[PDB]
């Protein structure tokens, strides 16, 4: 790129090769036009060994940077130290001033003892890396070794004429550098250039002599030079050219790659002090640079002008301001050392950085006054204490090598052990705050070779000679192998079940094909750089992407050939988005690029507000024909955790413990009903107990990092058995007073974690044996069942469910268009299926379903608010009977209530939530609590309690404790009846198919279905959970997901994805049109 402050062309370091090692020796080269030194790659290039230079004189000490910047120090006496506050560099010369020699301490303790007494040695500490410069007989200080604080040395070997002939990295590999005469010698240039680097050996001493012309050598990189000695080509490990350069008087005027990238430059004068006046990118933007006294205006081929402002002269010049294309002005402030101390965004919000001592930083203050203190040891310069915005402190205790032996956080202390002599900075034993101990093993490359978890299960890894992972073994002994080409790209991935993936790449290293052993593959086409141009899947569908000169996506074409348009402003912000169905959304932003308004297709505008930290503060949803304008207010803690989410119908308050675990979540409805969920956590932040409202508390029995092995609810105890991979293989339930278990559920797993067999045996005699069959793709192509008819599944090449054939029944064939829209019996442009399953569907301007008419004449009207949430529906049956339902939501778009009006009688159901999981159904005379398996949406057990409406004084007490964020005491609970416990018996997808009571008998049984998840039943209210995260609405027949409503008879949602194109090309598709394989728990 071009640095507008200086006008110079900078090529950041490009890693030609980096073979894995305890301290990887990355052969990185960079170019700076203002650098006048003629290195081994020409003028302006820096290489390993010749990156940093050191000059010591009787009056001054100069440390030349990689970019050629001359950092000046006073005279460096033997044993003296110098610190560069502006550069964060430490220099110490070996030897002593004359007094008694003492071993170096603090930051200088990591150097070898012999180097400390050598007057002709100088140690440079740049961050965490030590550089050893030794004065040679000719009087030039050149790098000899680059070791870290752990002692991993990278020896540099020099010869006569000062050529870096060999490098030996920390893994024992020997590199050989070959030099040839590329141009005639001149002033300051002998003509020798680096013609390539040879991997001389992987272990042992390097060969004494290497013939460059001898075939069979391993050239890690090769370089070509012109007649003037300028670098014109870079070749990879193979013979392929990967970089091309063009020069005018040793000034970079054109650089790029064969295909892909090509940038040309123009200079006012062809000299190191010259400045770029035009940057022409092929297929991109042409930028013109105009240099003023204290500013640089960068014009653009699109007409945009950006102004970069700077102050100071010489090495103290700093980038002070930035005026963008629309006039937005950002400002930066610097201290006396040139370090950044303040940063004001275009809105004026200021971020401070208070610095003290030689650590260069001790505190950063957010615009919302969120301080992140960071204390560093004065002597060793290593992190000691870390404090976040909530005053939670992490304390680090370190050994002599600076390894953090114990990390003391707000929740216990984590202890580390370093018992490997070869690798003294790799932890070989980690003890978590809970007390579990993990053991690690490392190989000669410093990479992980074996991982033993808290339970004693060992994961093993294997690597080749270049430190690339080629084999992984799980505790069960399943191998995952990898294959690489000479360039180091992954070209093969053999999984544990025999399924092998193969990858292909183009000349630029971009992935172009992913294929399986079956043969069908996904193809990638690329445009300029990493800009994707076309994706073709196995089914033949294509997603075409169109970009403009600025690299912004301006058109997206789906599989049906329908385009989605995008428009941008001068700041490359999306200001208009037209979907595949013509739904147009307009966006507005403030000076800080924050979305403050979003006009939708119906002309209604949603306005957003933010706090000082940039987090969302309030959403002003516009009024619609069936809902008033509503304001949803959000409050955040200093660390970014949500503290409250207020709305017109509910007020959700989150309370966190001293560690940050969500301790209490209280939901206070507008009518006074309060539902609170209380959790307790261990030292690892894993829930140990859970109280769902007034339901009996659920005690979770976990081992290790939260692996569940038991559960206690009332008089019922659950027991889980797990294999070496911590996958559940057995499940029992026992009730106090009963000798035999209520049920036993045993499972067998496929190598890739796929369920292979499952057997459920209730105490009442119900035996459910289920066998699963999979194809090479991992798709479930068959289920053998002894309770339900066996089913065989067929899928197309795109992964969509084509047919399902139950035993002794007609097949259910499904047909899709290119985009993935179900076709009854050409295509649905715009992805709005207006006719399927004998029903007519009518959509509004925003894509929401607003009318469904059946063949018999049944009519379903739907009404939405400005947040696209179903707030009112009317259903008319063929028998001339009506039904009205109204829904209420909180600020998080979670349905909190359901009011169904039928025959003039009004019935209200309130729902309690535990995050994204609905865990309560408060009916008029019954509280039904659903407990999901931890960390998922799979229902585990159900609690039913007879209840009565709370007295007015109790409701006030609940609201009082909710305001203070404390759980209601157990002594003030209402007169609820004894809880009845029922157990969910789900299938492979977590869809409940059976429900067993406390005696092992069956309460509810459901016949599996493709898209409805269960065959239609007379009373869907007995068991309303379908799929994962879906609630079956009895009054309407829709399945309520977390954010949208699902149409079981159409296999799609009733409204477009709130994420828009982020969710996928089709805004209505559910579970990738494969309901037997995937699920949408949050409805996104």
């Amino acid at each position: 790129p071009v640095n507008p402050m200086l006008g110079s062309k900078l090529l950041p370091e490009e890693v030609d090769f980096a073979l894995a090692a305890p301290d990887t020796f990355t052969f990185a080269r960079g170019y700076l036009s203002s650098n006048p030194r003629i290195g081994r790659l020409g003028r302006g290039w820096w290489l390993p060994g010749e990156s940093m230079h050191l000059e010591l004189s009787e009056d001054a000490c100069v440390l030349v940077d990689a970019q050629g910047r001359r950092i000046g120090f006073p005279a460096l006496a033997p044993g003296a130290q110098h610190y560069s506050g502006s550069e964060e560099l430490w220099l110490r010369r070996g030897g002593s001033s004359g007094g008694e020699a003492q071993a170096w301490r603090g930051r200088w303790a990591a150097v070898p003892a012999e180097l400390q007494t050598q007057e002709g040695s100088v140690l440079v500490l740049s961050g965490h890396s030590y550089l050893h410069f030794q004065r040679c007989p000719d009087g030039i200080w050149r790098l000899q070794a680059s070791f870290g604080r752990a002692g991993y040395r990278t020896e540099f070997r020099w010869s006569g004429r000062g050529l870096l002939t060999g490098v030996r990295d920390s893994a024992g590999r020997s590199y050989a550098l070959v030099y040839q005469q590329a141009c005639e010698p001149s002033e300051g240039d002998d003509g020798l250039r680096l013609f390539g680097v040879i991997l001389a050996s992987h272990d042992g001493p390097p060969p004494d002599y290497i013939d460059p012309q001898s075939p069979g050598l391993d050239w890690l990189v090769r370089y070509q030079f012109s007649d003037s000695g300028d670098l014109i080509a870079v070749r990879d490990r193979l013979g392929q050219v990967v970089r091309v350069f063009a020069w005018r008087e040793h000034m970079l005027v054109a650089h790029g790659e064969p295909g892909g990238l090509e940038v040309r430059y123009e200079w006012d004068v062809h000299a190191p002090h010259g400045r770029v006046v035009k940057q022409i990118e092929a297929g991109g933007l042409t930028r013109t640079f105009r240099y003023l006294r204290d500013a640089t205006e960068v014009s653009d081929s699109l007409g945009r002008v950006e102004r970069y402002e700077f102050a100071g002269e010489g090495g103290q010049r700093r980038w002070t301001a930035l005026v963008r294309a629309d006039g937005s002005r950002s400002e930066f402030d610097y201290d006396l050392f040139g370090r950044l101390v303040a940063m004001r965004d275009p809105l004026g919000r200021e971020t401070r950085r208070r610095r003290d001592g030689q650590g260069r930083m001790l505190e950063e203050e957010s615009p919302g006054k969120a301080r992140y203190r960071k204390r560093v040891d004065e002597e060793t310069g290593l992190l000691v204490e870390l404090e976040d915005a909530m005053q939670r402190r992490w304390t680090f205790e370190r050994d002599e090598r600076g390894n953090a032996t114990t990390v003391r956080g707000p929740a216990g202390s984590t202890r580390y052990a370093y018992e490997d002599p070869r690798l003294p900075d790799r932890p070989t034993r980690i003890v978590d705050p809970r007390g579990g101990e993990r053991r690690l093993e490392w190989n000669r490359f410093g990479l992980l070779a074996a991982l033993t978890d808290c339970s004693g299960q060992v994961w093993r890894y294997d690597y080749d000679n270049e430190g690339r992972l080629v084999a992984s073994s799980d505790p069960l002994g399943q191998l995952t192998r990898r294959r690489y080409d000479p360039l180091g790209q992954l070209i093969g991935l053999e999984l544990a079940d025999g399924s092998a993936l193969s990858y292909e790449y183009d000349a630029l290293g971009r992935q172009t094909r992913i294929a399986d052993a079956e043969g069908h593959a996904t193809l990638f086409s690329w445009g300029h750089g990493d800009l994707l141009a076309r994706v073709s899947d196995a089914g033949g569908g294509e997603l075409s992407y169109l970009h403009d000169e600025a690299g912004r996506l301006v058109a997206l074409t789906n599989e049906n050939g329908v385009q989605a348009q995008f428009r941008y402003d001068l700041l490359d912000r999306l200001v208009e988005e037209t979907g595949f169905d013509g739904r147009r959304q307009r966006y507005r932003y403030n000076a800080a690029d924050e979305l403050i308004a979003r006009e939708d297709a119906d002309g209604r505008e949603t306005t957003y507000a933010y706090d000082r930290d940039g987090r969302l503060a309030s959403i002003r949803v516009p009024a619609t024909e069936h809902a008033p304008a509503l304001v949803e207010r959000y409050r955040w803690l200093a660390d970014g955790r949500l503290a409250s989410a207020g709305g017109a119908d509910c007020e959700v308050r989150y309370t966190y413990d001293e560690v940050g675990n969500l301790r209490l979540e209280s939901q206070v409805h507008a009518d006074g009903w309060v539902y609170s969920v209380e959790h307790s956590h261990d030292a690892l932040g894993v829930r140990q107990t859970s109280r769902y409202g007034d339901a009996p508390p659920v005690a979770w029995l976990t081992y290790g990092p939260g692996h569940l092995h038991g559960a206690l609810v009332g008089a019922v105890e659950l027991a889980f058995e797990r294999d070496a991979l911590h996958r559940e293989v057995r499940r029992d339930a026992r009730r106090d007073g009963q000798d035999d278990a209520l049920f036993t559920q045993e499972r067998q797993h496929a190598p890739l974690g796929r369920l292979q067999r499952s057997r459920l045996r209730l105490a009442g005699g119900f035996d459910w044996q289920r066998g699963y069959r999979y194809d090479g793709l991992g798709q479930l192509v068959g289920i053998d069942d002894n309770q339900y008819p066996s089913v065989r599944y067929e899928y197309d090449l795109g992964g969509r469910l084509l047919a399902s054939r139950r035993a002794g029944a007609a097949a259910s064939t499904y047909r899709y268009d290119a985009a993935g829209n179900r076709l009854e019996g050409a295509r649905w442009a715009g992805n709005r299926v207006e006719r399927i399953a004998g029903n007519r569907y009518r959509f509004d301007a925003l894509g929401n379903l607003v009318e469904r008419i059946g063949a018999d004449g049944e009519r379903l009207r739907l009404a939405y608010d400005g947040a696209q949430r179903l707030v009112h529906l009317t259903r008319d049956y063929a028998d001339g009977t009506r039904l009205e339902a109204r829904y209420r939501y909180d600020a998080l778009s979670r349905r909190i209530a359901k009011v169904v009006l039928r025959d003039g009688v009004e019935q209200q159901v309130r729902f309690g939530w535990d995050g994204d999981r609905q865990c309560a159904e408060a009916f008029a005379r019954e509280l039904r609590t659903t407990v999901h398996e931890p960390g998922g949406f799979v229902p585990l057990l159900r609690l039913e309690q007879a209840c009565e409406p709370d007295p007015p004084e109790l409701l006030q007490l609940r609201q009082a404790f909710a305001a203070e964020g404390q759980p209601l005491p157990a002594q003030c609970v209402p007169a609820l009846g004894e809880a009845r416990i029922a157990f969910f018996h789900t299938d492979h997808l977590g869809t409940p198919l059976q429900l067993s009571d406390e005696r092992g008998q069956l309460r509810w049984q459901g016949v599996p279905d493709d898209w409805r998840a269960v065959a239609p039943e007379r009373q869907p209210g007995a068991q309303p959970i379908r799929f994962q995260g879906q609630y079956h609405d009895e009054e309407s027949g829709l399945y309520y997901n977390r954010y949208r409503y699902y149409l079981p008879e159409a296999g799609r949602y009733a409204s477009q994805d709130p994420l828009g194109l982020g969710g996928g090309p089709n805004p209505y598709a559910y579970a990738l049109n494969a309901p037997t394989l995937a699920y949408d728990p949050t409805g996104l």
Partner: peptide, 27 residues
Amino acid sequence: IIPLVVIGAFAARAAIGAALGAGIELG
């Protein structure tokens, strides 16, 4: 999003983290 518990073509960690094309377009 859309978790595929059984299918390891794209939901598998090894099959999705080893794809350079899908691992570089995220940002």
